[PDB]
């Protein structure tokens, strides 16, 4: 009936002065815009159908045409930025916000979905959706005693749309909008559905990706222990944003980093630092690097949790991106650590894998490793054990690598390598 209609036929039906013909043609457009291979979104836009679909959103007297036009517009808004813009330019934002209060759950959900696509386009459309007042009716749909009474798909779509209102930077979402959403986000983070948990974690990872003031807003809501719990989840779509959020929090103050340690996050790192997913190992090692960039008592917690052998491990063998982050973790540790802590790092076998990485064709990793060597030598100078370290670097073929770096293209590498040879290998 409404299957495989041409755009011309859809236009003829929508341009008729018959509500039922308009409904049948709108359903036909929805089905066209719903096909798996190449939906004709641009053809529907060029035919001038977006203003007609937006006017159909306001037809309270005909709920099926509201649903069909909301679905058609959701499919257009899910496309390119230009396609989303066409939906916004048609006046769809206030029309979709008005549909959030609809007595029909399938229409309200379609309006939630459409607004998530519009807000997800970027900062400007996210902030425009907020200015049109979407946050209050969206939050009202979740103002229930128990989230378990809501339909699964309905809750998943609401969580996803709220996460897009938390997403993007330059600028980050408005402070008052973040404050308004956060109590509902904390509640969704304690829900039992894995898709709700994944998207709630993604929302938290976006909000913590910024200055310390942004991290503070989140950490003050007491979510860090729940994030550490999710960091231990078996589902990879939950662990990925939970680790991103924890990794973002430890870029903050020493006090914000301490809340992550206090919640017991370091006990999860033996498995994260050996995770079969390279991106988990990489971001776990980045997280570790920001913790070793902290206080000496925080470096001590890394030691006590037996995580230094795990850092020796990732430095020895891992994908290059993880090895670069491991090099950073070692340089941060050696910069802020005590002599005893630096001595412990050498005893765990850090020298040989640190030297083997000097062969890498990446100027940044060479600079970072050369800095770590200098810091380890500075500790050895305080104990008068520089000779023991010089022999150790010579034996694993590290001397041949530093000597070769004296003729390197980079200025900082050339200067640092010449300094180490003149001070400890002459």
């Amino acid at each position: 009936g409404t299957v495989n209609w041409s755009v011309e036929d859809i236009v003829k039906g929508i341009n008729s002065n018959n509500l039922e013909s308009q409904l049948q043609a709108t359903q036909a457009a929805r089905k066209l815009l719903s096909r798996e291979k190449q939906p004709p979104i641009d053809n529907i836009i060029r035919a001038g159908l977006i203003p007609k679909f937006v006017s159909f959103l306001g037809k309270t007297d005909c709920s099926p045409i509201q649903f069909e036009s909301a679905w058609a517009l959701t499919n257009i808004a899910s496309g390119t930025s230009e396609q989303t813009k066409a939906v916004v330019d048609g006046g769809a934002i206030p029309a979709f916000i008005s549909l959030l209060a609809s007595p029909h759950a399938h229409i309200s959900e379609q309006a939630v979905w459409a607004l998530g696509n519009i807000a997800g386009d970027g900062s400007a459309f996210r902030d425009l959706v907020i200015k049109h007042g979407a946050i209050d009716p969206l939050l009202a749909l979740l103002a229930v005693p128990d989230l378990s009474t809501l339909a699964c798909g309905y809750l998943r779509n609401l969580t996803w749309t709220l996460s897009n209102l938390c997403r993007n930077k330059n600028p980050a979402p408005p402070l008052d909008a973040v404050e308004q959403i956060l109590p509902t986000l904390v509640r969704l983070l304690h829900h039992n559905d894995p898709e709700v948990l994944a998207d709630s974690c993604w929302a938290i990872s976006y909000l913590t990706d910024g200055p310390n003031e942004r991290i503070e807003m989140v950490v003050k809501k007491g979510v860090v222990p729940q994030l550490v719990k999710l960091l231990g989840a078996t589902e990879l779509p939950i662990v990925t944003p939970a680790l991103r959020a924890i990794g973002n929090i430890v870029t903050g103050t020493d006090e914000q980093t301490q809340k992550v340690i206090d919640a017991g996050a370091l006990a999860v790192f033996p498995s994260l630092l050996t995770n079969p997913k390279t991106n988990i190992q990489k971001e776990a090692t980045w997280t570790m690097s920001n913790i070793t960039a902290g206080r000496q008592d925080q470096i001590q917690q890394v030691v006590n949790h037996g995580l230094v052998p795990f850092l020796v491990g990732v430095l020895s063998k891992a994908d290059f991106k993880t090895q670069k982050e491991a090099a950073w973790a070692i340089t941060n540790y050696t910069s802020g650590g005590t002599v005893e802590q630096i001595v412990y790092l050498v005893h765990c076998g850090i020298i040989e894998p640190l030297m083997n990485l000097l062969s890498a064709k990446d100027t940044k990793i060479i600079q970072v490793i050369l800095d770590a060597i200098s810091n380890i030598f500075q500790a050895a100078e305080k104990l008068g054990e520089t000779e023991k370290l010089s022999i150790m670097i010579e034996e694993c073929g590290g001397l041949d690598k530093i000597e070769a770096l004296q003729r390197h293209e980079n200025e900082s590498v050339y200067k640092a390598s010449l300094n180490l040879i003149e001070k400890y290998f002459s």
């Binding site: 719903s34 989303t84 379609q110 696509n117 996803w160």
Partner: peptide, 6 residues
């Protein structure tokens, strides 16, 4: 992210 319906 953006998502299509069906």
């Amino acid at each position: 992210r953006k998502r299509g319906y069906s």
